[PDB]
Design a protein around this nucleic acid. Structure first.
Length: 206
DNA sequence: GCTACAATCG
DNA sequence: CGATTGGTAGC
């Protein structure tokens, strides 16, 4: 993770030089993934973040953990299953998300979700095909889960709206780029596109 | 003080 | 189509 980042930062400093410049200005990558989280947890966290800022997402999960858990820990599948969507919605989850989160809990409970060991053996394409079967989980959500939970290093969430806004400035484009364009422009960042995305995501903070 | 900012479904 | 969860950065 440490050697991984230093190695990634070096590669990003070895492509064309706007990347070298951004890396130097932003400093060391502080991305902190949580692979210790079970798949159902990582998935629920990713679902919750849809259309919501990290702060908004945090306030919702905090309530969720504070009420639905008996130890401020992340609610277990069983605990979630035994909570109706009405109560989940009161924590701040949209009604739709409440429904999907309940279903994810049921799936985890009934061993319908790939085990973490199997997930770690799946390529991103396989993961996409597998988790996209879950209601409320598609490309973006799986990318976020791969990055923030799994800790994968070569994930380029080219479809991310904020990343597109950043890519427009960074690459000096005349208009917000389409998904395909972002993927093309960041190809040189392989095999550390996750870290490249993170750096782009840090541009606002500058 | 205001208010823009992923995936599903009748 | 037209809704949807909310903290808060940028006005």
């Amino acid at each position: 993770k440490d050697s991984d980042y230093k190695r990634a930062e070096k590669h990003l400093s070895s492509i064309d030089n706007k990347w070298s410049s951004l890396v130097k200005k932003v400093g060391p990558c502080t991305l902190t993934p949580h692979p210790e989280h079970a798949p159902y947890e990582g998935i629920i966290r990713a679902i919750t973040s849809q259309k919501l800022s990290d702060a908004a997402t945090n306030s919702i999960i905090n309530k969720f953990c504070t009420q639905c858990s008996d130890n401020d820990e992340f609610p277990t599948p069983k605990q979630i299953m035994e909570t109706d969507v009405e109560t989940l919605h009161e924590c701040g989850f949209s009604k739709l998300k409440s429904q999907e989160i309940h279903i994810v809990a049921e799936a985890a409970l009934n061993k319908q979700i790939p085990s973490k060991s199997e997930i770690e053996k799946m390529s991103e394409e396989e993961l996409m095909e597998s988790l996209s079967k879950i209601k409320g989980v598609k490309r973006w959500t799986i990318e976020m889960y791969s990055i923030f939970t799994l800790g994968r290093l070569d994930i380029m969430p080219a479809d991310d709206s904020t990343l597109k806004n950043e890519a427009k400035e960074f690459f000096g484009l005349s208009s917000k780029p389409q998904t395909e364009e972002v993927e093309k422009l960041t190809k040189p960042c392989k095999p550390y596109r996750t870290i490249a995305a993170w750096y782009l995501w840090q541009i606002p903070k500058l």
